[model samples]
Target: HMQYSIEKLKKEENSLAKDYYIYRLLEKNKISKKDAQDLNSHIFRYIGKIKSELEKIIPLKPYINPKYAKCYTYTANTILDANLTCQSVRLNSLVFIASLNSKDRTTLAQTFKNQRPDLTNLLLAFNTSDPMSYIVQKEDINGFFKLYNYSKKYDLDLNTSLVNKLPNHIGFKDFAQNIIIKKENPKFRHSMLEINPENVSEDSAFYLGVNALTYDKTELAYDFFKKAAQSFKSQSNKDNAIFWMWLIKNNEEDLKTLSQSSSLNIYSLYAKELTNTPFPKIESLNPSKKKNNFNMQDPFAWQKINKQIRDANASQLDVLAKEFDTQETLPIYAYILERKNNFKKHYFIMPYYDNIKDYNKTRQALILAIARQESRFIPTAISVSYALGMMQFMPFLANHIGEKELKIPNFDQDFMFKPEIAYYFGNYHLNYLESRLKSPLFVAYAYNGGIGFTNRMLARNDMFKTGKFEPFLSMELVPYQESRIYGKKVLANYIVYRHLLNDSIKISDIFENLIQN
Candidate 1:
């Protein structure tokens, strides 16, 4: 069993698991001291109490906690001299090095300059609080740009003259977007626009188009989007640029072209709606005839099956789809069909209709809309960040809801995996959001982003107010990219589900209501 565990640990790719494996080998007196030292340096990069046993075997030189401030002062020279496993640990230790006396700080900075020049400039950027001074002086353009943005957040009055002095490198894409597009700096914008499209990054080109649109320069926006479309490597980004081009021109021929694109994102959906182009038909699949013993409510079981389907070929997917065609495994069936490019099939499902039927038709549709996006109505779904079940509740929120809101006795996280309980929790949360927010778009933003994020966004005088392209422009400019896209998709889903639920509403009417509210 110990040998089998070791084999399994060797196969595991996670760093923490490797740390345990090395520690176990040392505990068992199996590994050579040199091998242990090499593995310890490679795997145990983090300085924590968890590696106490391993530290005894292969002690980390210049052993100091990066988190402790005094460690920086005590081992300042030692750390500067010693080569740490992770460069990030060395950089973090510099925070305290900056706080030391001027002589010590300058000496350490010079030593760090020899060791890691990039990190040295970063330390200088923080110490002097003059990001622009080193922004041009530093060779690490990305690091300096990040430091520049960080300084701006603290209301630092950074000189814009360095914008012209910036190197003609693609790494300046983000910096260009911040100054030329977001800040609307005329001189910088002109300088960027004067540069050939082939020379600028795709992201910079896209933002330049957005900046042009903000100024009502439709012709210029069209030109920039056209350039962006040709430059972008991603099909989705290409689709976005093309859509903007169509939006600017509003030509029926352009609309027809967008409607036929292979991708089915928000842009294509909008174009299809405008052109009166019907979506692929929604069809149903027959239930499985066999009595399969698959545990549909077990997240781990679902994860394993999900991985198998992901790795399966076309014919294998067909067999798996038929095998899991029961109501309990509808999501898996839908996923398989989707893998086969069978979008006409019933991908959106109402698994827990009985749980949500008590609500009004609109509320029921809204609930289904959110669920379809959150988990595709998969009861046992778990997100990468451990968001639980159908509604994707973060663990802390689930515990609070289970304990404080519902007052359930001895609540377990697994309860969230049940469709009925997930629906109930989601509905209760929505009731709170709906009371404050009148629009589904804003509610969706609050649902994906936190309520506080939504509140701060709505509090801004520039958003959702009556202006040129009022809500749509505001929607595009939303600071958080996830919430921006998520809100639009959820609203689209809500529109479709509303039609399905016999509570039909126009997407335009929803947009109109946003500004009025």
Candidate 2:
């Protein structure tokens, strides 16, 4: 049994090495899908067999034998010397060091001096090191820079004291925008920079434009946007500035000109739609002429594809996603790019909803609308918090619902991955809210922003309390941009779902019906 387990682990390690090869090729800009696909088959299969055979002679657990640790590290060191960023090899090196006790780590460090002792120090710090506990003993700013760059490259959100401490130095502040300024979150964005024509940089111009827009200074906004459009490096950012320019100036000629330039871009699509021009039909790379004969009804087909795309880069995943861009495809194309970094398993788990619907099939559509917003139906999905699975149930809620309400003996964390269990709790959670508040808009707001936050939004000295009291208008003014966007998307999804169910409703009906009583 031990021999069998060793062979199995060796196969897993070999798979990691194969992925390392692909990652290296990708990092070097030499990767082609043909070569990557070939590696996935013949080369990797051969590597797997040899690794299994080697495992019969050598144990896998480095803790059991120092020889195993030495073998993996030497192999990883060879890859690292290439200056290629490969996490698989780095992980292997970390695992070996972590398997060692403090005495073993010190003894190992003694044998390594000429091969960049500083690099060794950095590598050792990462071996099962918690960011909160670890101290940076390095005396230079470059060490902090290296750590920051490493975190960015690895997609790690490591909370370190260095992030707060580094910004105190003026030289490092500009280089540390990712840590300090969070440009992605709207709340973090403020027009704090005092801008003038004398000041430079595309970012400064963009910020000046946004500042003008915030104060409803249309002409100033247009002038700043024009400057930003001329200087911004990113085509998307440039198009966005131009979009605002056209909208503010009402430039019909420029709108028509921009609409013809790109069909794939969202800004161009809006421009075309605004001018009442038909969107240009761009042919797909692999277009289907006939109806797909694959088992569309089987959610497993969708589930299998979901797992395959998680490892895929944005470009590669875009190609795969385009194939599933049909109107009724499980995830739908927009859902594929919703989080971009995270590909969700939307309608793939629908087959198991029969068990979930035992609570009530009548409310399944509404429940699904909520699920679509919460997780896009990914079963193994986890939020930044420990909100688990399709329903995005926090551990506390899942436990409360399963144990307190359903009277399950002891709720298992593993069961949260089940569509049946997740949807059951989510369904009841909505029902619990419905008993108190009858509106879907209220339920959605409360679900995302918490009940207290929802109550505050309604009670605040705003348009919600004083004016027409429309949900769409109230959502637009919601203080938290996340909850505001969440409520809109969920409500929009609910409307679309109703249309799909043959309820035959117009978009205007949604806004009208959701107004306060």
Candidate 3:
């Protein structure tokens, strides 16, 4: 059982699983020197003195603690062998790696050259402190702009050949901003414009297409969107590219294709609406006969269940779906069914509806909308960023909300997982936002990105102004892609929830309101 648990935990990347795995290994007296070394390199956080024991086994290896820089003991061998990911570790490693000979320095620099050329350049600066020398020696063009940007601070002659080798995604923005816009360096701009469209990343091509369209270069924009459509991995991205292409050429076929896309996103929804197609039909889930008394609101329970769902086969998914098919565990049921490709059977349930029933319809819908997007209504959900509970509040934000806003005593982060508290806090937070921003669309933006970000965007003269593609184009062009897509999704969820609650509203009216407000 212990061996099986260790193997199972090895497959999990969560700190909780890793910590438990280490604990079990130590309790069983089975943690070998190799295990300690591997754990030292891999796990960034450990429970209690497990870290100390691991460090003792691999005393020569660089430590991975985040609390203090002094935890890391760097020798030349350890610096080279260490898996340097944390910024502090990387910075410390760079200093030690810099003290080596030229050949060893280049070899160490090569490790970060393709992936992190900024660090490579920083390493190079320790030797010559000259950007020109760094650029000449660095072969990979992944982050060459870092070196180029550094060179601008000095009087060194610029290497234009490096521009020819610039990779698709990394440095285009810096090159465009520094050279084309600010300096108006014609040669650099020309080199950037000459970069082959076939080689550009999907996102880069899409952005380039947007840039071309902004300047009335319709044909160029169409070609770039076409390239983006072909190369994009996600159906939503492809739908977006195709939608833009259709907008450029007024192609019905492209609209039809987008309308039928599997991904239910802003682009696909818009395409369906444009093509006069009805929204995809959704069926309600049936409850299971068996009574599941499992605590779905506990983070650990959810994590373990989530792991089982991940590892379970199609047959196992069927069983799991049935087992978790209750009002409390509806999200798990929906997730299990989704894994089995049962998309139409959705459970967009308002599990904690009694908690927020006193609020107005719009506020209730907004709360549910954000909750669905934030955690799929999983009360115990925790983000990779450690955003906790159904509302997914950051620890500091939750503490502030509890102590400062609500004046609740001895408020712990764990309280967020309770459905009533999550809904109450979410509604209270939204009350502040809704007061400032009336429209759900804008509120969603402010909710995902901060209110300051949304305020700055609303303050812009260009955004949400009445014109061709008035709001949709502005929505697509929001600088922060996460907030942009997040707003759209939350709006869609709000619309659907409103319909369910018998307070129906059209998405078109919401778009118009966005422009007006």
Candidate 4:
């Protein structure tokens, strides 16, 4: 038994606490009971075995992190005494059990089977099958693992439903039978088509709509969105479809339909704005609103920073960040010794550093868009992989930027913690990318994905060849799923920022120029 899982549980302690506690801090603001239960189930599974091992070994604590000690203590008390009612054990628990000796794996898998019989039987069947035996609609499996994770990563319920239905759905039973056990092929070419129109269920239609949207097949995507919007049973799904349709075209009718959605929330707010309908306001208690388009209230931002500190994968400035956390304010204390800038109320967030003044209007907008998408403007934000700061620069990239571009011989991860420094470095990187690749879309893809990856993707895909490249269509073929989505969001953010900063483009003009022309 490796110490990895124990370390992993110890590592995840702060994140789980943040979810459980900060949710309470938010006064349970829009917190879903199921979501909370899911996190609890997640914590228990990771802790259960690790705690058992701890009770067995009784070793001196190898970990110095205090949060881990607290979580372990709490979990121990609950596991030993309190009656726990968990939602259900997850499939990953079975994977962990498989890593153990034989009897344990079977026992664990059997236990999981008791909880989710259909899913477990499917996994059990999968564990023994030939991976190549599965065929979907006579197409070779392309993108199985990526699609599998995408569903979970984005929490796309429709995708999860499709994953669940695949075991018995026509053309997917074989694939589903092999999923839980087979290693996912990352390089698989995932494709979905709307050809089977008559049989396309609402979820299926929505799936095809996303596929079409991803590939820049707008007409096809529109048809799929239209169908899904008109037919999806749930108000949320219908509203979502209508939102996408409205995104593609500034259709008055779609706007009207979208605002009519039974669910009154974020998407509805977005729709109402399209029709110039005044948004109703009766918000309570959440204070962080519209601070430089990067709000302090975002859970993802907290999740980002807390994860690094939790894992002890902190930057040199981690203690500084934590102190600020203790003091309980935004992580905006970073400063450079060079210059002092004056106030401008038009600016979103306070530009505390001197480097921001170096960029022009368009570049500033671009920077804002990328920063918003990357870290939601958390300067000390550290991703699970240790990608750091407001710009979310990986250490290697930051090191390269510091050494080569900024000409700092002593490149340090600490430099990334300062908002201005990160932006200056990030701006240099974006400019370097833009110098070779002219289009903002390509630049956005290159910034998030690697330049080499973007270049290779464009060159390799026949439909996306740079010579006579169709921007929208070529974008859909951007290869990496994260990059593909990243590029879209950055551009969408760019569009919003551009309109706000420059007032240069109308919403109708976007159809002719933005996503597709």
Candidate 5:
């Protein structure tokens, strides 16, 4: 029996590895870019020695035992993006770090040191490292000047320059004038220099910086950003000032002072010892309550957006809410609610909602509620699990949603953008779960955790203990985060939904008198 099972497993492993080898070649980018796009091509190259080697070793590694299935997917994707191959590129990247004695094949820290400048800058732009964490320790701004050329090549106009505009809104006029020109402005530059233009909390100052830079006044831009940083610091708005400081270049001297001086922002405290300065912990640098913006992440987003519109209208909101109301949600409003969505609510409910009008109302309401509660619509909003987006969707789950439903070809699945799509899918799944549950809360728990996991706990409910599988009881037994929160949020949102749809709605007076006898 053991031998038969082992044989079965081997066959499965072999097939999986065969699939992975073809996939990794494309992923690792060490292979030639001339490969064709087809499954049979993969099948042919399956067991080739050099290619198959990665498949055999990577999955079995002790520290990071990779999921073959995920590897296969990434592998396939690597194939699609030939530019994604890394090992070879990384090996080539070693030339950059050659000075670090990495050629001995082990001592290197960064493979990007000696690589192509464009590629290096692009890499740095995409870098996942703590960009602010780089120390001038001994390196003393080692490669800072390298990016100067790249930065210069892109911005010839630099504020007040006549930007030419194109018909479809392409090129310099709109892109540079509206976006780039603003960036060159002293306030934008300083604000970017400081990191938190918001925390600088001086809109006029930031804009002033813009004007200074645009009109050939780097000194003015520098002073403006400097003041923004100083005011926020004096006000004890450390996070904002730190944000602003981050926007500005990582001046080792400024960082050293910021780190040593308790008068600076909180983040600077992290590097206080290295700065060799007297550091006392500062208060007021930490984010305090009620200051966050809306995140606009709705589980029942389509319905929620509409609900917010209908509800906010019934209450008191800006004129935009009243004008954009429908049965669902106004897509545009979702963006307004969550700045990360770039105020372009035309996401979600693509090909799904027959009309954006109905979809908009539903989506916006839920977005408001979620954003109201969760991270307040911050797009860079990260959760304890590092979940992202205005909605706080888990990064890992991104692939799952993509694999399961995001595959309706020819159309890119940026499902994160589509409020109605996530809502409809979430609602549809919940509705399906309802077949097994009488309670909306139960359905919510199931939404957070798979049906199987919830069912296992539900099974525990039927013990000699009578109220066995009740949500609260089930929650006590299953200590998972998703199920616990999902139940509360879903129930809470439903009440908010009712409130929005009717002006007379109150948290206390939620039609309690109409309870079924």
Candidate 6:
């Protein structure tokens, strides 16, 4: 028990939680194939390094600690997606899916389905099953649904008990789906557009437009929504049309008036929440994403990890399959998605807002950015520091966050494995640091080496900027490679995550991309 001691464990958790995203964005940079193929190998190799470090630390970090590991695995197995009061069912596709070249998207779809046919078949097969009896997994289900348009709300018959299903949404009801469907289905990506645009009812077009605003075709989506508001006969429909038009253009002031004008309708509420991104102001709000962390150019330049996951989940993948698409990781992704509604609040216990509540879109972006950077959304996460969970909480930090002060109800050994707690609190901690530093990049640094370390680094940056130069103020002169890189990683993550979270942005504008040395 003393081998992995709590202190060392907490350090590992903090390290992973803070650095997870850095790794993810970097890994994505490594994608060479059309859609990130030969990818698992890189991740698994990276994980093994963490296993080696596990011994160097103490209560033996869970990955190497058989007892803790068992608890985590079991907790994962036992924890039903529906049991969590915090998450409930919600949409996460907007922020989770990969939007690379159409070629890349197609590649990912084919590769994922081919490599994990069982998974794809299961998901596709479920359409015929009773929603209650369905269960599936492998790859980001949310991402998959987003890519395929599988969960159409009304058209889909999804069960709620299991993690993946027809009912879950990307958290909004904008006609984004309608627009995409119209294009994809031809029958109605815009039946309105084709059903004689001249005669198309304004309300239907307006609703269709909101859906377009959700994903691709934003500018045109706005036009559609705008047409509805101006032409629709109903006053409510007219107000909505006006609202969507202004909303898509990123008009905050008008949005405020709409929010105050009257109780927001469901779609309007979703729109409002989308506008208020929770990301704290950071220096590198945008960064170049082309550069990959585990760059594959050298191939030898990066770490791969398919074997590690196979080793970890190989024996259990089938056993875990019985739960449906959640596949050995229902708790982790569900935990991440659920926390979006509640953020740092009590798990799913408060009154449902039907609108955004404690959760902030920006903060959700932060968590996901961390996930994208950390393990590329891998749930059975075991870091170089032996950290675990979607948020990479070390056993040490897990115990602390799991404590009463944190109000992590149902606290137990398997707790960290649940992932939602780590994801929520990790974002909470990031926000806390953001509050202190009032800078997103610095908050990310604080997450890594702690606030004190981040502050010193900032002071150093300030001194260097002030012309106090002697030897240098360059990153090279920053003293600690780990901390300096840590700062860079977070900044990098902020760019990618922000871009992912908000459609109108990209990481490249805020920072530059670099190839390996």
Deviating ranges (above 4 Å) for candidate 2: 1-308, 312-365, 434-442, 463-477, 512-517
**lDDT of model 5 at residue 124?**
42
Ranking by TM-score: 1, 3, 4, 2, 6, 5
- Pairwise lDDT winner, candidates 4 and 5: 4
TM-score of each: 0.70, 0.43, 0.70, 0.48, 0.28, 0.32
Q: How do the residues 421-516 of candidate 6 rate in per-residue lDDT, one tens digit apiece?
A: 556667666766767775454565566567786667566433224322111113323444455555545554554444444533433222212110
Which has the higher TM-score value, candidate number 2 or candidate number 4? 4
Query: Tens-digit lDDT track for model 1 on 37-58?
Result: 5454445344443256566766
How far in Å is the alpha carbon of 468 misplaced in model 6? 12
Two-way TM-score contest, 1 vs 4, winner: 1
Best by lDDT: 3
What is the Å distance of residue 441 in model 4 from its true position?
1.7
lDDT per residue (tens digit) for residues 77-115 in model 4: 132232222213223333332234444334434755665
For model 4, the run of ten residues with the poorest summed lDDT: 336-345
Ten-residue stretch with the least lDDT total in model 3: 150-159
> In model 3, what lDDT does residue 516 have?
63
| Model 6 stretches astray by more than 4 angstroms | 1-305, 308-358, 461-476, 503-517
Please give the ranking of all candidate structures by lDDT, highest first, separated by commas. 3, 1, 2, 4, 6, 5
What ranges in model 1 sit over 4 Å off? 1-196, 200-204, 215-217, 231-239, 286-291, 342-346
lDDT scores in order: 0.68, 0.52, 0.70, 0.50, 0.37, 0.41
lDDT of 4: 0.50
Residues 1-517, model 3: lDDT tens digits: 1133555656666564356445546656777775565565445355345566565666655545655454355555555555556332545444354556566566666777787666666666656755445644564453245445544543333354554456444666555544422334444444444455666657777766765665566787788789999999887789889989898899889999999987776677777777788876555665754447888755557878888998987888888877787866777777787777745443466776789889888888899999989998888886645577888887678889998888887787667888899998898889889899998989899888889999998888878887675776687667676787899788878877887788977676787797864
By summed lDDT, which 10 consecutive residues of candidate 2 come out lowest?
1-10
- lDDT of candidate model 6 versus the reference: 0.41
lDDT of 2 by residue, 402-453 (tens): 7777887756543566777877777778888777666666788888878888
lDDT, residue 53, model 5? 49
